[PDB]
């Protein structure tokens, strides 16, 4: 029973709201397994500074599921929060984007983006930013009102292995 995509993401439940930036990222995954996966599903969270990732995109945590049976699969996914040392006080007080991405045998078919409002809940700090980032007073509010879902067409089960690894190019 291969109904196109064997795994489709029904959505994600942003449990953490309101949260802090240095507060653990907790997303609950809900997806429908059409046929029991012969391979494993890898779910991960990436933190993205706005778009091009001014903080250098960072995989906070990655989980692997199996054996994954038919039906809806649902579990809470917890990712360790990013350190503000990567994003200076004036740099993490911005809206950023979280990417939840699932890879099946190396092929990523689902990457979901969520925008996060990061600000100082204290007006005095919001208006006048301190030298040292006090992330414990920085509020992370995920705009779960707008899920950005991107689907990549991959080949499930009946795929012949050839180019499953991204061409490593000499960056910098």
């Amino acid at each position: 029973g291969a109904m196109g995509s064997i795994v489709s993401l029904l959505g994600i439940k942003v449990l953490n709201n309101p949260a802090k930036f240095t507060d653990p990222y907790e997303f609950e995954i809900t997806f429908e397994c059409l046929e029991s996966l012969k391979h494993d599903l890898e779910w991960k969270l990436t933190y993205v500074g706005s778009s091009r990732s001014l903080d250098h995109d960072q995989e906070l945590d990655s989980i692997l599921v199996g054996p994954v049976p038919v039906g809806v699969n649902k579990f809470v996914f917890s990712a360790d929060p990013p350190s503000a040392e990567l994003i200076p006080a004036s740099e993490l007080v911005s809206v950023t984007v979280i990417l939840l991405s699932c890879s099946y045998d190396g092929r990523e078919f689902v990457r979901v983006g969520y925008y996060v409002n990061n600000e100082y809940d204290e007006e005095e700090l919001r208006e006048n930013p301190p030298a040292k980032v006090q992330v414990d007073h920085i509020v992370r509010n995920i705009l779960a009102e707008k899920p950005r879902v991107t689907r990549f067409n991959i080949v499930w089960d009946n795929e012949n292995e050839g180019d499953l690894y991204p061409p490593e190019q000499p960056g910098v």
Binding site: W43, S62, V72
Partner: peptide, 15 residues
């Protein structure tokens, strides 16, 4: 109404 909580490992791939 059914669900599946699974046990999502932390990478820990084995072959």
């Amino acid at each position: 109404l059914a669900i599946t909580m699974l046990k999502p490992r932390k990478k820990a791939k084995a072959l």
